[PDB]
Amino acid sequence: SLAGAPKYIEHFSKFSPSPLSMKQFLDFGSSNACEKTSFTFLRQELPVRLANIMKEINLLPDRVLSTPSVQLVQSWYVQSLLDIMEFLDKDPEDHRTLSQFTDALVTIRNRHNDVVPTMAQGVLEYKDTYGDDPVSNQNIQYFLDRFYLSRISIRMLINQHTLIFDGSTNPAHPKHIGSIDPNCSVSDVVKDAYDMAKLLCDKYYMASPDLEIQEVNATNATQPIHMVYVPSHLYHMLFELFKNAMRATVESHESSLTLPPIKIMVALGEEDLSIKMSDRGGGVPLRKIERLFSYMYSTAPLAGFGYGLPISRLYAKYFQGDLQLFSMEGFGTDAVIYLKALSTDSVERLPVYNKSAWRHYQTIQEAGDWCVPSTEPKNTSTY
Amino acid sequence: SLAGAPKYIEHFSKFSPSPLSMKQFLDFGSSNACEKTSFTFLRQELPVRLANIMKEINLLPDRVLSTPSVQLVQSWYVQSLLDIMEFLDKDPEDHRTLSQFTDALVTIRNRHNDVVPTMAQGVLEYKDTYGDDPVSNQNIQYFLDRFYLSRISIRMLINQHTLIFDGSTNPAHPKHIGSIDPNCSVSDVVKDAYDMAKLLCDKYYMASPDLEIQEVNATNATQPIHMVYVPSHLYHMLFELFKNAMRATVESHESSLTLPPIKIMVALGEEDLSIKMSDRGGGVPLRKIERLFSYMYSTAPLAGFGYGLPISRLYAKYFQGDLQLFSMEGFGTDAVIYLKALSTDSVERLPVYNKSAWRHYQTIQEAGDWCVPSTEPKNTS
Amino acid sequence: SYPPHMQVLLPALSPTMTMGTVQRWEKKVGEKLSEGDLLAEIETDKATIGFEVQEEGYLAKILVPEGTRDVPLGTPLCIIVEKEADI
Amino acid sequence: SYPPHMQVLLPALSPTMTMGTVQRWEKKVGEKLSEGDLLAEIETDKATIGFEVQEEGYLAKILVPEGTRDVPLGTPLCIIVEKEADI
Ligand SMILES: Nc1ncnc2c1ncn2[C@@H]1O[C@H](COP(=O)(O)OP(=O)(O)NP(=O)(O)O)[C@@H](O)[C@H]1O
Ligand SMILES: Nc1ncnc2c1ncn2[C@@H]1O[C@H](COP(=O)(O)OP(=O)(O)NP(=O)(O)O)[C@@H](O)[C@H]1O
Ligand SMILES: [K+]
Ligand SMILES: [K+]
Ligand SMILES: [Mg+2]
Ligand SMILES: [Mg+2]
């Protein structure tokens, strides 16, 4: 019941979300992936993940909350909570209850399909009024990484259930366990992502850098590098990075014609799988690197919006990896996706509401930790 | 008076240190640098910098303070403060007062020569007892980056003064303005740093990798890359990085006359001067990178101590630069030094003690705002 | 001044959690407890949750030591009294 | 009767500093002031400094505007009242 929504939130937000390993996902979709145990798990966990993050939605400045776009996703989360909550006391071992559960998840996924651009519009709507505010910046930034990561994990869980149980029969990948490829060809995903970005590049500039691909398997000298991953997550990251590198290469070669290739390095160690994308696209000054992962910086008032970088990083952070950038202004840039090599180490990174999360919101403006130089420095030159 | 030392701290700790640009250092040692203004400045500024950091020393846990070594340097910082204060009411324009001032700076520089191994000894003697706890560990790390960066700055001011105003008959160079080279050949510093490192390596392993350099100047396609800098600082960083690179390169090939070279890439744009050092020394797992800049981690219980990385990064940070490490486990590692390209942007990076600095020592164990998984994750099969 | 104290019972940190392992006491005997601090680390088979202090006071005794496996719900773990005159 | 007000005189932030520029106000009229908070930015010829509050109260009125160049020491900058009953 909609009236009781705030107490459902208070109930489930008290609980801690349950992070899963890729080993756990994979081992579950074994042979007799037990729909009963997937339903009963999700019936509980999804509300836990929803309530936790909604608790944090309610903690952002009222100037952001008031915007139509924010509230539009707030309304989506409230409904999703309820649609799922109408299953809590339903009976497993009944195919009706299970079948209409996956239907409900399909609807939730269709409902939440535009969450990314819509939350981005709310920040834009915030930017088209109060503008900038240091303390407000921090809170929105802290919130967005968490919100978006919470989202990816919710998508994950939903897709796993739907792809396995009979929201498929023909259209999927009859080798994947859900969205998970146990023998994912890292190189093929690199080539796929390159193909699309190149295509978009040629159809927006008429010029394009080539691809150079190299591999170093330090675990087995000769072996092509494969891993247990979600190829679409991987695809998203590389597709995005590729586009950034392609724009940069073409735009910084105003005198050119003779485009320096984008070089890819795939390394595998005992613990890491590293993918380095190198470009000779003129680089970015160091003080601007940090800005590039800011949501409030890359938005106004191949290159679409300005959320490709922060979001790709979240994809990489989701299974305990990272995406780091290091340019050299005047030469080019290196972007690096870091992934856990082992499916045991590939554990969900999930935001958690608690006193610790609460205090990251509503924080004060502090005095500088280090010296701040004067704008007009004292001229110490002689007579 | 020694007895009145605690109030001298509280007086000067209240003030803010004064960050200087490299342009300012260069304009002072313009034509005829004036020892008066250098005197009247340092006479006051050095108390300030001493007092600020000293106030932070007495905020780290009693368990670290009680150790002979931390307390040994504490007593040095006490003395240098009083020595410099003995000049406060002194008369400028009187050559005797100036001449004995630089001598006091020489004395203070010698007193403080071995601050780095000593503070490292204290933390070691601390690890020899209480060992580990996150609340103590975090404070020490926060303190040490600040303490060491502070020292570099005090040694900078003392080195500027003495080089300029002491011993006119020639060591030094001195196309340099103190320790600052207005036209510093980045490449040469790289070659020099490589030569010393290749020497140490070639005799502690009897094998070393070659060097390759490449420069890309975006401001002036042809021109060799130069900058206003302190060659020592630059050399220190590169030297330290070369050692790491050579060790790992040699120790990963564990069977080679076919060692892959260390590659250097020097780039200059409108704002950054960037030096990338690539080696194929087999790399480090990512979870271990952040650990390489920890003071407590690289100390137990060619490759000497463990403070090479953290300290070199502080040199890089001291004039608004950085030192970033990124590897690929099983391949190699890139290490990047980032320096501002303009002497106007190369401003001193100094810790201020204030209420904001106070609360960084006064925090406690919180829960994480992220989910920590179970150590025995539920069997899903 | 002989009061009825405040009791610390193990709650459901996960909705289907019926028992939990008391991993790591982050507060020792005779410590200050402000509403919100990290009291201990509680680990189930699904998560490792940081158990936070709800009611203000001071920790006087611990009923369940570090490393005790499978402690059920509603189980007393430690005692809270408002006054620090118990040390 | 006069409300128990606090006054904020400009201090020397450098030991030789006798006067300084008031860069910008980081706390507007009517705001609470917990000890530690960044009140304003003060810029001299040697440094820009974050000026912090020392006693609790509220911002009542600004006496010296933003951008005001070279204000001598001991000069009042704003009035602080310990009570909320001024808004
Ligand atoms: N390889 C690169 N070289 C130079 N600049 C880059 C590179 N990658 C990113 N940037 C800069 O960082 C920003 C890219 O951030 P990003 O989040 O990818 O948004 P976007 O590429 O502008 N558009 P989109 O990703 O489609 O939303 C751009 O403004 C670029 O100036
Ligand atoms: N280029 C590199 N390749 C692989 N490992 C590295 C590299 N650089 C640093 N490391 C690791 O980081 C650790 C710390 O390095 P560093 O701080 O330079 O101290 P150190 O090399 O151990 N000896 P010292 O420099 O005398 O203190 C090293 O022991 C290496 O394991
Ligand atoms: K929670
Ligand atoms: K200070
Ligand atoms: Mg992009
Ligand atoms: Mg070293």
Question: Which CATH number do you get for residue C83?
Answer: 2.40.50.100
- What is the span of the domain harbouring residue B313? 176-349
Residue at a domain's end among A175, A205, A240 = A175
Number of structural domains chain B divides into: 2
Extract the tokens encoding B298.
């690289």
- Angstrom CA distances, A216 to A264, A275, B246, B264, stand at 11, 10, 20, 21
Shared-domain flag, residues B19 and B158 = yes
Shared-domain flag, residues B167 and B308 = no
CATH number at residue A133: 1.20.140.20
Q: Is B194 left (phi over 0), alpha (psi -120 to 50) or beta?
A: alpha
> Please, are residues B102 and B162 in contact by the beta-carbon 8 Å criterion?
yes
B299 phi/psi in degrees, rounded to 5: -160, 130
Q: What is the CA radius of gyration of chain B?
A: 23
Question: By three-state DSSP, how is residue A4 classified?
Answer: helix
- A220 exposed, middle or buried (CB, 10 Å; 0-12, 13-18, 19+)? exposed
Q: Which residue of A has its CA nearest to C45?
A: A18
Q: Which sequence positions of B are flagged as catalytic?
A: 236, 240, 243-244
A246 among the known binding-site residues?
yes
| Nearest CB neighbour to B354, from listed D14, D47, D52 | D52
Catalytic residue, from A176, A240, A263, A348: name it: A240
Q: Is residue B367 part of a domain?
A: no
A241 among the known binding-site residues?
yes
> Please, are residues B242 and B197 in contact by the beta-carbon 8 Å criterion?
yes
Separation CA A118–CA A120 (nearest Å): 5
In chain B, residues 176-195 whose CB comes closer than 8 Å to chain A: none
Q: Is the CB of B237 under 6 A from ligand 2?
A: no
Cβ neighbours of residue A284 under 8 Å, at least 6 residues apart?
A292, A325, A327, A329, A333
Residue B97 CB coordination number (10 Å): 14
Q: Is the CB of B301 under 6 A from ligand 2?
A: no
Which atom of ligand 2 lies nearest, measured to the CA of B309? 17
Q: Which residue of A has its CA nearest to C46?
A: A18
Q: How does strand A322-328 pair with strand A332-340?
A: antiparallel
Strand partners, B41: none
Is C47's CB within 8 Å of B371's CB? Answer: yes
> Please, are residues B92 and B36 in contact by the beta-carbon 8 Å criterion?
yes
Residue D32 CB coordination number (10 Å): 12
Is A364's CB within 8 Å of D34's CB? Answer: yes
Extract the tokens encoding A20.
């899963």
Shared-domain flag, residues B148 and B221 = no
CA distance D69 to chain B (A): 19
The closest of A277, A204, A203, A198 to A234, measured between CA atoms, is: A277
Q: Is residue A100 part of a domain?
A: yes
Q: Is residue A365 part of a domain?
A: no
The closest of A54, A50, A52, A58 to A14, measured between CA atoms, is: A52
Extract the tokens encoding A83.
């649609």
Chain B residues with CB inside 8 Å of D16's CB? Answer: 40, 44
Q: Is residue B84 part of a domain?
A: yes
| Nearest CB neighbour to D45, from listed A366, A372, A374 | A374
DSSP C2: -
Number of structural domains chain D divides into: 1
Chain A residues with CB inside 8 Å of B285's CB? Answer: 269-272
Chain A residues with CB inside 8 Å of C18's CB? Answer: none
Is B371's CB within 8 Å of A17's CB? Answer: yes
D85 phi/psi in degrees, rounded to 5: -75, 60
End-to-end CA distance of chain C: 16
Separation CA A152–CA A177 (nearest Å): 18
Range B351-371 burial, b when 16+ CB lie within 10 A, else e: bbbbbbbeeebeeeebbebeb
- What is the span of the domain harbouring residue C54? 1-87
Q: Is residue A355 part of a domain?
A: no
Is C45's CB within 8 Å of B373's CB? Answer: no
| Nearest CB neighbour to A19, from listed C12, C47, C50 | C47
Interface of D to A at Cβ within 8 Å reads 26, 34, 36-38, 41, 43-52
| Nearest CB neighbour to B218, from listed A30, A330, A373 | A330
Shared-domain flag, residues B183 and B149 = no
Q: Is residue B23 part of a domain?
A: yes
B118 phi/psi in degrees, rounded to 5: -75, -50
A240 among the known binding-site residues?
yes
Residue identified by tokens 């250097």 is B264
Q: Which helix (H) or strand (E) holds A328?
A: strand A322-328
End-to-end CA distance of chain B: 75
Separation CA A189–CA A237 (nearest Å): 10
Extract the tokens encoding A381.
């030159």
Which atom of ligand 2 lies nearest, measured to the CA of B249? 3
Which atom of ligand 2 lies nearest, measured to the CA of B310? 17
- Angstrom CA distances, B297 to A227, A374, B66, B141, B371, stand at 31, 37, 21, 10, 25
Q: Does B300 reach chain A within 8 Å, measured CB to CB?
A: no
Which atom of ligand 2 lies nearest, measured to the CA of B281? 3
Which residues of B belong to the annotated binding site for ATP? 240-247, 279, 298-299, 304-309
Residue A183 CB coordination number (10 Å): 10
**Chain centroid to CA B276:** 19
Cβ neighbours of residue A6 under 8 Å, at least 6 residues apart?
none
**Count of all residues that appear for chain C in the document:** 87
Residue B111 CA to ligand 6 centre (angstroms):
26
Cα atoms in the Cβ-side hemisphere of radius 13 Å centred on B247: 10
Residue A292 CA to ligand 1 centre (angstroms):
7
Handedness of CA C15, C17, C18, C23 (dihedral sign): negative
List, chain by chain if needed, residues with CB within 6 Å of any ligand 1 atom: A 240, 244-245, 248, 279, 281, 284, 292, 298, 303-309, 333
Shared-domain flag, residues A102 and A56 = yes
Which atom of ligand 1 lies nearest, measured to the CA of A332? 3
Is A272's CB within 8 Å of B285's CB? Answer: yes
Shared-domain flag, residues A65 and A148 = yes
Residue A226 CA to ligand 5 centre (angstroms):
26
> Please, are residues B36 and B95 in contact by the beta-carbon 8 Å criterion?
no
Handedness of CA A13, A18, A19, A22 (dihedral sign): negative
Residue at a domain's end among B175, B200, B216 = B175
Residue at a domain's end among B130, B154, B175 = B175
Q: At what angle do helices A186-202 and A231-251 cross, to 10 degrees?
A: 40
Strand partners, A262: A211
Counting other chains too, the contacts that D81-85 makes at CB distance below 8 Å and 24 or more residues apart are D81/D3, D81/D4, D81/D5, D81/D6, D81/D57, D82/D3, D82/D4, D82/D5, D82/D6, D82/D56, D82/D57, D82/D58, D83/D3, D83/D4, D83/D58, D84/D58, D85/D3
Q: Does B286 reach chain A within 8 Å, measured CB to CB?
A: yes
Given in angstroms, what resolution was this structure solved at? 2.6
- C82 exposed, middle or buried (CB, 10 Å; 0-12, 13-18, 19+)? middle
Residue identified by tokens 């189930």 is C44
Q: Whose CA is nearest to atom 9 of ligand 1?
A: A244
Is A48's CB within 8 Å of C16's CB? Answer: no
Extract the tokens encoding A10.
């208070």
- Give CA angle at B39 (B33, B40), nearest 5°: 115
Technique used to solve these coordinates: X-ray
Spell out the SS3 assignment of D49-85. EEEECCCCEEEEEECCCCCCCCEECCCEEEEEECCCC
Shared-domain flag, residues B65 and B20 = yes
A10 catalytic per annotation:
no
Shared-domain flag, residues A201 and A149 = no
Give the mutation candidate from A146, A217, A219, A272 for the B interface (greatest B CB count, under 10 A): A272
Separation CA A113–CA A179 (nearest Å): 17
- Angstrom CA distances, D57 to A167, B354, D30, D87, stand at 62, 20, 10, 13
> Please, are residues A243 and A201 in contact by the beta-carbon 8 Å criterion?
yes
CATH number at residue A309: 3.30.565.10
Q: Is residue B116 part of a domain?
A: yes
Q: Which residue of C has its CA nearest to A88?
A: C15
Contact D/A (≥3 CB pairs under 8 Å): yes
Cβ neighbours of residue A145 under 8 Å, at least 6 residues apart?
A310, A314
